[PDB]
């Protein structure tokens, strides 16, 4: 109904710092930094003081204001991704054919290499994005862990990875094997 002013609050903790020129953000905290352009979204930011920042829209249509709430949650996800850091956990299950899974570096590329998939000979590489690190699970069988600050990078990489083993022309109810996510947690544990 052409709401005149809409607004949300985002909460900066003590440790972390944020620098916002026009619609660019940098968010810096102990784990590190991130940046993000938001020039496509047409809103206003304001500090009040140093534990709370206000986003806002004037003369909002429904689309404009739904975008407002979205951008808040995006920036909060960045904040969490510095102070906690995000951590996504997968498992790679087989009935007959054990995956050989590995990490390689081709000119600094950080590819992720899978073999013996369903008795194939095929190598499949998957890139790694910047800003995210791998670890195969120590003392846990058939499990891999990713950790990073960019949640979008992490999830995109793992979603790619389970999108690679989309086994095709074959009855999914039988071929239960594949590589999938166990859970989405943070790094810390404690907090």
């Amino acid at each position: 109904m052409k709401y005149i002013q809409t607004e949300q609050q985002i909460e900066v903790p003590e440790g972390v710092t944020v620098s916002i020129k026009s619609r660019i953000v940098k968010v810096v905290g102990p784990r590190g930094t991130l940046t993000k352009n938001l020039k496509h979204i047409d809103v206003t930011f304001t500090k009040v003081n140093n534990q709370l920042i206000k986003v806002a829209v004037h003369n909002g249509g429904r689309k404009h204001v739904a975008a407002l709430r979205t951008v808040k949650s995006l920036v909060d996800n960045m904040i969490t991704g510095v102070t906690k850091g995000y951590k996504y956990k997968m498992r790679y299950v087989y009935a007959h054919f054990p995956i050989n899974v590995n990490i390689v570096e081709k000119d600094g590329a950080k590819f992720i290499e899978v073999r013996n998939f369903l008795g194939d000979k095929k190598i499949r590489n998957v890139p790694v994005r910047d800003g995210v690190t791998i670890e195969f699970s120590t003392n846990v069988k058939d499990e891999i862990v990713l950790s990073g600050n960019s949640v979008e990078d992490v999830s995109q990489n793992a979603a790619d990875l389970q999108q690679i083993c989309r086994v095709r022309n074959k009855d999914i109810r039988k071929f239960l094997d594949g590589i999938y996510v166990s859970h989405k947690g943070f790094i810390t544990e404690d907090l």
Binding site: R91, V140, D142, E143, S182, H183, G185
Partner: peptide
């Protein structure tokens, strides 16, 4: 158990 309870159950 795998979804809610966060536990590896094979």
């Amino acid at each position: 158990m795998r979804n809610k309870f966060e536990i590896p159950t094979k």
